[PDB]
Amino acid sequence: ATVKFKYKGEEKQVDISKIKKVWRVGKMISATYDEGGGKTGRGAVSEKDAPKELLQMLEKQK
Max Cα-Cα span within the chain: 40
Return the H-helix or E-strand segment holding 15: none
The CA-CA-CA angle for residues 7, 31, 1, to 5°, reads: 75
Cβ count within 10 A of residue 60: 5
Contact between 13 and 4 under an 8 Å Cβ cutoff? The reply is: yes
The hierarchical CATH code for the domain 1-62 is: 2.40.50.40
DSSP codes, 30-47: EE--B-SSS-B--EE--S
Domains of the chain, by residue range, sit at: 1-62
Q: Report the first-to-last Cα separation within the chain, whole angstroms.
A: 20
Rg of the chain taking only CA atoms, in angstroms: 12
Separation between Cα atoms, residue 2 and residue 24, nearest integer Å? 18
